[PDB]
Design a protein around this ligand. Structure first.
Ligand SMILES: [Mg+2]
Ligand SMILES: [Mg+2]
Lengths: 395, 395
């Protein structure tokens, strides 16, 4: 070992190619510095960086042995002196997830154009899902300070091309997320509990205000007071009744189950009501619940809540509390929500994900998901559909 | 979208290729099912699986547009009907780490041969380190039930070719390790504390027994009693003295620092002495310590330990305890040790790693490391050197 030689094998994949090459190289004084190999749609690329004697690399024997062995079976090979060549590639700085149903060629084309415009190099592309949504990952190297400009460009691409596009730090630290909190209403659970409760009072219509609150049109606490007031006079029995009518968001069970496989701490933070949520959190085996509480007198709702009120600032406060108890730094926390009520929590989390969200949240969130499948969150956390299905089939 | 078309682009990498292709495809009714792209040593492979109208795919317009655009800039492209082709590749079942200094071509060749012999497919190869040791990862798909035969074949390759070879489950669950324990003596710390203590009594020679114990020649407790007895009469001052003479294993700080980035719980389990280890565990900010305790009377060592004795079974018991307190399933635990004293602990852990170990441990351990760098443990945990250096340069 004294001088560096690069060997690159390409062509139609065949069994035994890898073994054959290193067996040939063993007849020469070769030590390995780096090997990279992949097969994509039956196309092989095998790049081998070696050190060998100056004696060996400055002779045609190494070349003839390698070229004869590789060409005979029908692949191409190149061999060249190195010495100035990088031994091992740098890690990517960021990763980009593109989700759609469909993902048009125009959409992906726009992503690639914006990326190229900002001097961002594409290091790798791969599929992460074929169901319930098409999912594609690009690992990239962003020029320093440009990731702000990148997220903006891709958010514009996202709205224009009807796909979800999320840019994430791909560093060792910032991608070992370990704690997640979900908003309940219209995130973990379908629809709005308070609307289901108001329907029992014949007030579903008025409780308008929920859409007003979630878009950020008014103060959460005052909207909460007006809405819960519509429940005044209802028997407390309604609580259990509504609890039993709750449907999980499509993909919710898969989401939680997979997060448990990964060792996540899981919790919920809601402006809804503890008596309806605790029943479900115990079933879903969650680690943390923060919620509001209905006032009850003589087995009847009074139409008020018992303070403290979990408001916008309160949701972030609960996240902080949870993370502190669990020993997880905020940078390694994830929060998932849909309403303006969730703005502070998502902003506080390491990764704030807007799920089918009002515009107010979509605009401050780290990432947005627009398809009615909560398990698309998993793709943003570095999981592939194949990995989910593999682990699920083993139980 | 009605019929499936595969487009494969190969050749010398050039800027703009990716964007160009999808821009061309956008002129046709193309929706994306899967994209895979990599560039290895300036060789591009871009495989694009699409759905488009039967109208479009059964006409030469799509072909001419793609072929003209790609060939003009000097790359190759193929286009073919699919319909029976896999949309997205299956996850790998296992991963194999090859570490060496050097890794000869003969060594890697032997790994590839054993792999091919057992019908194992190589899905991907990449470098994970160039320092302090050459590190290569192969992600593979092992035929069901054959991974036992594989580890045996590669352990033989390992001893014969002078490289470390470790085979690991590559499932979602079994690779989210979250807790690690280190043996102290000759693992986290250089040399043997009890030998350093015995040297103060002029008994370093006799305390023979330590090498006897670590190879499994005799019962740990009785070897411990004979060895600690040689300390009878030493002033307790010696404890602090030896504590201050301890040198961390090369790479230990990097190892712990990186495990903290990943959110690991970290601990030590030792047959050594708490008064010497607790001082160091607090400094290294560890989460758990189990150790033995020297008996002291009138500020003098008596030559006995205060029960309970952490023996072979005891080390596993401590690991279980730690994991239970931390909420980590045993399958997601890692244990690192060098002696026969560590056999039960390594066997209990999800991943048992023998570090520069006596043969007795090397033969039952899930993986063995033979280079005097503790941070090679990180490579076995899915970390690359580039990732370590990136995170370290950001602080
Ligand atoms: Mg909500
Ligand atoms: Mg030891």
């Amino acid at each position: 070992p004294k001088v560096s030689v690069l060997i690159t094998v390409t062509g139609v994949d065949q069994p035994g190619v890898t073994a054959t090459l290193f067996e040939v190289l063993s007849r020469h004084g070769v030590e390995l510095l780096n090997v990279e190999q992949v097969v994509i749609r039956h196309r092989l690329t095998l790049g081998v960086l070696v050190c060998c004697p100056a004696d060996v690399a400055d002779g045609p024997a190494l070349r003839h042995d390698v070229e004869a062995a590789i060409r005979k079976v029908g692949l191409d090979v190149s061999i060249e002196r190195s010495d100035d060549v990088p031994i091992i590639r740098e890690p990517s700085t960021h990763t980009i997830f593109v989700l759609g149903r469909p993902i048009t060629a125009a959409a992906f084309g726009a992503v690639a154009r914006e990326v190229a415009a900002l001097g961002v190099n594409i290091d790798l592309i791969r599929g992460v899902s074929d169901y319930p949504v098409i999912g594609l990952e690009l690992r990239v190297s962003v020029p320093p300070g440009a990731d702000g400009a990148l997220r903006t460009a891709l958010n514009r691409v996202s709205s224009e091309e009807h796909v979800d596009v999320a840019v994430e730090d791909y560093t060792l630290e910032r991608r070992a997320k370990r704690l997640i909190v979900f908003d309940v209403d219209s995130t973990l659970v379908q629809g709005e509990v308070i609307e289901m409760l108001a329907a029992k009072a014949g007030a579903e219509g008025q409780v308008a205000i929920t859409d007003a609150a979630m878009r950020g049109e008014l103060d959460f606490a005052q909207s909460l007071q007006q809405r819960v007031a519509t429940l005044a006079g209802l028997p407390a029995t309604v609580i259990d009744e509504v609890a039993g009518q709750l449907e999980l968001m499509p993909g919710a069970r898969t989401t939680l189950r997979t997060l448990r496989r990964l060792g996540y701490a899981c919790g919920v933070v809601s402006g809804g009501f503890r008596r309806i949520i605790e029943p479900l959190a115990e079933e879903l085996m969650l680690d943390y619940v923060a919620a509001n509480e209905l006032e009850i007198v003589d087995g009847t709702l009074t139409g008020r809540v018992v303070g403290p009120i979990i408001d916008r600032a309160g949701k972030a406060t609960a996240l902080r509390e949870f993370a502190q108890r669990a020993g997880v730094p905020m940078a390694q926390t994830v929060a998932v929500g849909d309403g303006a009520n969730d703005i502070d929590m998502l902003a506080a989390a390491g990764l704030g994900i807007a799920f089918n969200a009002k515009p107010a949240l979509r605009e401050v969130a780290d990432a947005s998901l627009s398809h009615p499948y909560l398990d698309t969150v998993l793709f943003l956390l570095g999981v592939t559909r194949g990995e989910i299905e593999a682990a699920d089939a083993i139980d």
